[PDB]
């Protein structure tokens, strides 16, 4: 609900994408069990896809730990200092894949109501409206009833 | 700052008490007997009687009621009213009050300075009368 | 010596500080001391305190705040002690109030403090161009309808005498001085370094030489509040703000053969005793005349 | 308060408790050696003090009677070794009150000692340092006590010791109360150690700390303190002594 | 509406309030100083004061006598009225009585309590309020006005 | 139940490094199970907030309330514990930081009526808490001057923005 | 009449936290010139009045000792004495009360 949450204007992290675009995702930590069924999809993903994804994205580090865990989890972390938590719990390979790619393309910025779609610095080129702008001046700059 | 409640009479010794009282009452008699003589002081312009005129009023003290008779034989009751001290206080010109008639402020009987407020006693010391009720 | 008004200030103050930290540099290293309470109120009472640090004010805080609101002056032995004046040796302390039976000590000290204030108010109320040489604080008895302070002013300034405007300004700044609450602080100096503080004011140095003349040890008694420092006889009240109703009544010029000296007449009262309006006015009328007792 | 209402509440019935209360220690210090009133000036002369101590040790009959019962009950025992272990038990005891480790503090100090050194200090910060022992620890005397009930013998070895210590006591809000950590103050302690004999675990302990009569008044405390006169009721008049 | 009513209504009614005042007056005249409820005492004060001007009418006057008969319950007290109380009051017309207000009662009901007294009783002096002395800075400041009101006359 | 307040006086801090501001004293003290009501209590404990302790005892002393005495004793207790158990110079250097009442565990009784109806009655109990802080009483807050309000107003007109504008 | 709706804690607050319902600060509080205790300006000192009350009580007892009945009251004025005192001629011819305490500070001889 709008009045429930915070908000943020639309923004770039460190003015990203202007000079050169920099993938904002820093590291990923997968935790799964070699044994448990819950991790099943995320095991297969680790086999086949992870390798290639790593090659897809040099900028991100990937830490993959089998541990005795019952709920498969992946934790994104961002240059923004932001961290995001996720469950890969009981998902397909296709599913996981799509999700990691979601994490890949995010700001790291928080998901909150974004007040308006456009962030513009100095929208006002050629002027910014003020009351007088369309009013004709008179001779001597006199008032309505002022005399000289 | 816990500043305490204070009235006048608090710290006065047995000695200074009647001195304060006499001092005040005396300056009262002086103050009243001074303006006892209006016409020689600086009397304002006296104007003739215009037809649509309105005279100043008074402040009185209701004394009692008393029967009184008419040459015709009928009986009345009447009010004993006593001016005690009536002194006009300030004057507001016509346009500074009603925009119609100018207003004349008038005072009542005299009372103790000790029990009134600073602002007021200041106003009176700039006139020079004792305090009115 | 080419010197600014602010520089005078910085000098007197910094010297005062050097003196203070010299009294502190005796290396007492917290020696314990003891005081007994001879007061009518809380007998059998005892204060183990810090020698040459703790004050008779800081003694009142072991009793109650009541003492602290109430007490202007402290009698230790037979002597009046200012409230913030640190105690020297182990002694016996009594406390003193405006409403007590024989205030005369207190009353004097009040008149004193009162004068000192006005002196300060005067000094800094005059243009940088002119010269104000502050003189002294003549000590009158209380039945005298005012308190007094002596001031010499620049020779081109000699002709004028004030308007109730100027006086009312003095009074305004006086109350503005009351407002900010400034402690009264006491230091004891040898004449040698005391004279260096005053310097340029001649009459001051003279008074220092007299005072340190009648005392064997060349002892000068210095009082300070905020930026201002004066030498006076006797103790002062503890806080600026004890004064409530304050005035500069009149000024009256008087002239010796060798000097032209204006006397300031003023009148004031403490919060505790505060006078009603009419009364206040009458005292303010008697405060107008010249009141002379220098001897 | 010492009070009992015998009017109602009767008398707590006299019990034989099935277990006799087992005390590791006896509180009392039997015989207190009172050091010479000139021990400050004889402490700057090495072979004056050391000579008087060793002399009064060899010469005393009680001392060597007690060291005889200790030696005959407890083999491998020596009086020339002891002031070493004793000076150690100290530096362990106080180092314990620093860290506030009370588990070791029981192993070291005696039943009578613990309540005191722990009690009033337990909410504050204690930081204490051991720098110099100016005069090495001196064994003053030994006392045995025979309980004919238990056959239990309690040896108590007295160690008079000169020391250099830096003590800083902070109050529970973080502010300093007693003394600096920067002054390695000179202290003269008269100390008492105790051991239980019949005990198979034979621990050697700190029993008590005694201060001689003329001992120097301690460091001035920081905060001012008020000693109140007697509280008066309304009808009671005050009276002042000369 | 109470306008110009001179008596507070106490006890069970008119007569009750009178016998109430009977006891209070009895006690006053025996013990010479009593503490009681502020209103009751303030009220009583009038009666206490006029009883003494009946006493001043001498042992012989009949009106005065049966008056004191009724108003003093212990008959023993009637002599003390005429012989003791009335003669030691001669010079002073109305100044018989001191009534002061005492701190509120320390019972749970906490009433407003006063103490009432015959001047020149023999009892410990009530700790009355004193005016400030004439050494006070203020009064002292007035003595100047005083002496300069003497010096210009 | 809950006893928490009392145990706030067991908290032992790390010593102060030199040069830092000396931290003021703090004392938590409270009485439990008072025969007073919670509310009537409230007013008393509201009366004394902010005052210097002697001021507090001044007011407390002369009031007619039952609770007056009791709060009073707690304040004396608090004072003396403050200087004795903790380290404080100057026992009049205190002020009241926090003063309040909680409700205690209530007894339950019958209140008869007539026609044999009965209300259920509560015998009331209550707790009083106070935290005392050594120092000069924190200065009471003056109403904003006109100069404040105007400043606000302007600050606001100058917070304004055209909205939905980009 | 029966209340139609439970009131809010807000409304209840604004009723009973109202300034008119609050306990006001009494500013006439002072200290006793004698015992340094406290009293309101217009009222006797409780403590001093207590010394008084006690003494009065004792006196009344000792004058219940000199009186041998419920109804017996003297026809003369009475005066009280303390350790080491004597009736003056002015004060002789009166009933006397002999008490053990030394004459107190506040009480005068008269
Ligand atoms: Mg009426
Ligand atoms: Mg009734
Ligand atoms: Mg009346
Ligand atoms: Mg029935
Ligand atoms: Mg039924
Ligand atoms: Mg209910
Ligand atoms: Zn008293």
UniProtKB/TrEMBL annotation, chain A:
UniProt source species: Sus scrofa (Pig)
UniProt-listed Gene3D superfamilies: Glutaredoxin (3.40.30.10)
SMART domains, A to Z: L51_S25_CI-B8 (SM00916)
Family under the similarity heading: Belongs to the mitochondrion-specific ribosomal protein mL43 family.
Disordered: annotated span: 122-148
UniProtKB keywords: Mitochondrion, Ribonucleoprotein, Ribosomal protein, Transit peptide
Listed GO biological process terms: mitochondrial translation
Subcellular location: Mitochondrion
Record Pfam families: L51_S25_CI-B8
A Gene Ontology cellular-component term: ribosome
Keyword Ribosomal protein: yes
InterPro entries: Ribosomal_mL43, Ribosomal_mL43/mS25/NADH_DH, Thioredoxin-like_sf
Gene responsible for this protein: MRPL43
Protein name as it appears in the record: Large ribosomal subunit protein mL43
GO MF annotations, alphabetized: structural constituent of ribosome
TrEMBL record, chain E:
Residues bound to Mg(2+) 1: 3
Superkingdom as given in the UniProt entry: Eukaryota
InterPro entries registered for this protein in UniProt: Ribosomal_bL17, Ribosomal_bL17_sf
Chief place of localization: mitochondrion
Binding annotation for Mg(2+) 2: 42
Annotated compartments: Mitochondrion
GO molecular function: protein domain specific binding; structural constituent of ribosome
Signal peptide residues on this chain, from the entry's feature table: none
Family: Belongs to the bacterial ribosomal protein bL17 family.
Protein name, as recorded: Large ribosomal subunit protein bL17m
Organism this protein belongs to: Sus scrofa (Pig)
Taxonomic placement: Eukaryota, Metazoa, Chordata, Craniata, Vertebrata
Gene (UniProt): MRPL17
UniProtKB/TrEMBL annotation, chain G:
Location of the region described as Disordered in the Swiss-Prot/TrEMBL record: 83-110
Single GO MF annotation: structural constituent of ribosome
Transmembrane feature ranges: none
Name recorded for this polypeptide: Large ribosomal subunit protein bL32m
UniProt source species: Sus scrofa (Pig)
UniProtKB keywords: Metal-binding, Mitochondrion, Ribonucleoprotein, Ribosomal protein, Transit peptide, Zinc
Subcellular location: Mitochondrion
Record bears the keyword Transmembrane helix: no
Lineage: Eukaryota, Metazoa, Chordata, Craniata, Vertebrata
Residues that bind Zn(2+): 32, 35, 45, 48
Positions with biased composition (Basic and acidic residues): 91-103
Family, similarity comment: Belongs to the bacterial ribosomal protein bL32 family.
Domain of life: Eukaryota
Any one Gene Ontology cellular component term annotated for this protein: mitochondrial large ribosomal subunit
A GO biological-process term: translation
Function: Component of the mitochondrial large ribosomal subunit (mt-LSU). The mitochondrial ribosome (mitoribosome) is a large ribonucleoprotein complex responsible for the synthesis of proteins inside mitochondria.
Chief localisation class: mitochondrion
UniProt keyword Protein transport, yes or no: no
Gene: MRPL32
């Amino acid at each position: 609900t709008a009045r429930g949450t915070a908000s943020r204007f639309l923004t770039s992290v460190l003015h990203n994408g202007l000079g050169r675009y920099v993938q904002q995702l820093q590291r990923l930590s997968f935790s799964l069990s070699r044994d448990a069924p819950s991790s099943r999809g995320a095991r297969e993903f680790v086999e086949r896809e992870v390798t290639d994804f790593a090659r897809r994205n040099p900028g991100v580090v990937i830490y993959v730990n089998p541990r005795p865990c019952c709920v498969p989890r992946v934790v994104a972390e961002y240059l923004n200092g932001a961290v995001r938590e996720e469950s890969i719990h009981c998902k397909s390979v296709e599913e996981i894949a799509a999700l990691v790619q979601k994490l890949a393309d995010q700001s790291g910025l928080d998901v909150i109501r974004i007040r308006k779609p456009f962030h513009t610095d100095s929208p006002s080129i050629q002027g910014q409206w003020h009351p007088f702008t369309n009013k004709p001046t008179t001779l001597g700059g006199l008032r309505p009833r002022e005399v000289q | 700052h816990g500043k305490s409640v204070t009235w006048w009479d608090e710290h006065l010794s047995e000695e200074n008490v009647p001195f304060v009282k006499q001092l005040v009452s005396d300056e009262n008699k002086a103050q009243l007997a001074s303006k006892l003589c209006p016409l020689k002081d600086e009397p304002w312009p006296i104007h003739p009687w215009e037809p649509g005129s309105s005279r100043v009023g008074l402040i009185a003290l209701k004394l009692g009621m008393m029967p009184l008779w008419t040459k015709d034989g009928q009986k009345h009751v009447v009010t004993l009213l006593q001016v005690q001290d009536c002194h006009v206080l300030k004057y507001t010109p016509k346009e500074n009050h009603n925009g119609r008639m100018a207003a004349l402020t008038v005072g009542g009987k005299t009372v103790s300075h000790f029990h009134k407020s600073a602002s007021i006693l200041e106003f009176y010391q700039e006139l020079g009368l004792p305090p009115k009720q | 010596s080419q010197l600014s008004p602010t520089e005078l200030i910085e000098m007197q103050n910094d010297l005062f500080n050097k003196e203070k930290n010299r009294q502190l540099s005796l290396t007492p290293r917290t020696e314990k001391i003891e005081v007994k309470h001879v007061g009518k109120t809380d007998p059998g009472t005892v204060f183990v305190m810090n020698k040459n640090i703790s004050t008779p004010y800081s003694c009142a805080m072991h009793l109650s705040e009541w003492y602290c609101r109430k007490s202007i002056l402290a009698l230790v032995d037979g002597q009046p002690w200012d409230m913030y004046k640190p105690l020297t040796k182990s002694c016996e302390i009594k406390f003193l109030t405006f409403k007590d039976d024989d205030p005369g000590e207190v009353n004097k000290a009040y008149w004193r403090s009162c004068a000192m204030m006005m002196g300060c108010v005067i000094e800094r109320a005059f243009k940088d161009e002119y010269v104000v040489s502050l003189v002294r604080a003549p000590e009158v008895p209380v039945i005298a309808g005012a308190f007094c302070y002596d001031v010499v002013l620049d020779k081109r300034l000699d002709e004028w005498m004030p308007t109730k405007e100027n006086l009312h300004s003095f009074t305004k700044d006086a109350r503005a001085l009351i407002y900010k609450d400034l402690p009264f602080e006491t230091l004891e100096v040898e004449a040698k370094v005391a004279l260096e503080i005053f310097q340029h004011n001649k009459y001051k140095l003279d008074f220092i030489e007299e005072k340190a003349s009648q005392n064997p040890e060349r002892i000068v008694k210095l009082h300070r509040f905020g930026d201002f420092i004066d030498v006076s006889e006797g103790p002062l009240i503890p806080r600026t703000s004890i004064c409530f109703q304050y005035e500069v009544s009149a000024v009256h010029n008087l002239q010796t053969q060798s000097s032209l000296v204006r006397r300031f007449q003023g009148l004031s009262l403490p919060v505790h005793l505060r006078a009603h309006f009419t009364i206040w006015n009458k005292l303010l009328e008697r405060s107008r005349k010249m009141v002379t007792e220098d001897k | 308060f010492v009070e009992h209402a015998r009017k109602a509440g009767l008398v707590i019935p006299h019990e034989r408790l099935e277990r006799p209360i087992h005390l590791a220690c006896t509180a009392g210090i039997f015989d207190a050696y009172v050091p010479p009133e000139g021990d400050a000036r004889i402490s700057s002369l090495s072979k004056e003090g050391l000579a008087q101590r060793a002399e009064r040790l060899k010469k005393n009959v009680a001392s060597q009677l007690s060291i005889r019962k200790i030696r005959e009950s407890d083999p491998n025992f020596k009086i020339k070794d002891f002031p070493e272990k004793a000076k150690d038990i100290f530096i362990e005891a106080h180092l314990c009150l620093n860290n506030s480790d009370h588990d070791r503090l029981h192993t070291l100090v005696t039943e009578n000692c613990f309540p005191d050194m722990v009690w009033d200090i337990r909410y504050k910060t204690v930081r204490w340092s051991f720098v110099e022992s100016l005069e090495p620890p001196q064994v003053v005397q030994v006392r045995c006590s025979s309980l004919m009930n238990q056959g239990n013998i309690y040896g108590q070895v007295t160690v008079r010791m000169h020391t250099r210590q830096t003590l800083a006591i902070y109050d529970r809000f973080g502010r300093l109360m007693y003394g600096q950590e920067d002054v390695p103050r000179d202290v003269l302690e008269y100390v008492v150690f105790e051991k239980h004999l019949v005990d198979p675990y034979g621990s050697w302990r700190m029993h008590g700390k005694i201060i001689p009569p003329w001992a120097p008044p301690k460091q001035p405390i920081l905060k001012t303190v008020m000693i109140p006169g007697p509280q008066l009721k309304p009808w009671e008049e005050f009276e002042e002594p000369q | 509406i109470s306008h110009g009513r001179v008596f507070r209504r106490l006890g069970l009614g008119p007569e009750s309030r009178i016998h109430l005042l009977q006891n209070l007056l009895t006690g006053l005249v025996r013990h010479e100083r009593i503490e009681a409820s502020w209103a009751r005492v303030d009220e009583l004060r009038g009666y206490a004061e006029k009883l003494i001007d009946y006493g001043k009418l001498g042992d012989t006057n009949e009106r005065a006598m049966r008056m004191a008969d009724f108003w003093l319950t212990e008959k023993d007290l009637i002599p003390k009225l005429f012989q003791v109380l009335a003669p030691r009051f001669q010079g002073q017309n109305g100044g018989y009585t001191r009534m002061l207000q005492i701190p509120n009662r320390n019972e749970q009901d906490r009433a407003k309590m006063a103490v009432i007294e015959y001047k020149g009783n023999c009892l410990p002096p009530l700790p009355l309020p004193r005016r400030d002395s004439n050494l006070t800075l203020l009064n002292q400041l007035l003595q100047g006005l005083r002496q300069d009101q003497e010096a210009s006359s | 139940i809950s006893r928490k307040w009392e145990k706030k006086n067991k908290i032992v801090y790390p010593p102060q490094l030199p040069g830092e501001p000396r931290r003021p004293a703090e004392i938590y003290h409270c009485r439990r199970q008072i025969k007073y009501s919670k509310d009537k209590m409230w007013y008393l404990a509201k009366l004394i907030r902010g005052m210097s302790i002697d001021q507090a005892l001044a007011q407390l002393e002369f009031s007619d309330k039952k609770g007056a005495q009791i709060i009073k004793e707690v304040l004396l207790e608090a004072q003396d514990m403050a200087v004795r158990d903790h380290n404080v110079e100057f026992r009049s250097n205190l002020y009241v930081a926090e003063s309040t009442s909680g409700r205690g565990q209530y007894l339950k009784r019958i209140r008869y009526h007539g026609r044999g109806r009965f209300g259920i009655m509560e015998k009331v109990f209550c707790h009083y808490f106070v935290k005392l802080v050594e120092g000069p009483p924190p200065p009471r807050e003056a109403p904003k001057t006109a100069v404040a309000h105007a400043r606000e107003y302007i600050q606001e007109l100058r917070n304004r923005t055209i909205t939905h504008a980009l | 009449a029966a209340p139609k709706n439970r009131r809010s804690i807000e409304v209840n607050r604004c009723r009973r936290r109202n300034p008119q319902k609050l306990i006001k600060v009494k500013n006439n509080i002072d200290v006793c010139p004698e015992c340094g205790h406290l009293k309101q300006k217009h009222i006797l000192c409780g403590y001093c009045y207590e010394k008084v009350r006690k003494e009065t009580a004792e006196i009344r007892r000792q004058m219940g000792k000199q009186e041998g009945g419920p109804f017996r009251a003297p026809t003369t004025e009475t005066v009280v004495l303390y350790s080491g005192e004597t009736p003056s001629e002015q004060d002789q011819g009166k009933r006397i009360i002999e008490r053990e305490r030394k004459r107190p500070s506040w009480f005068t001889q008269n």
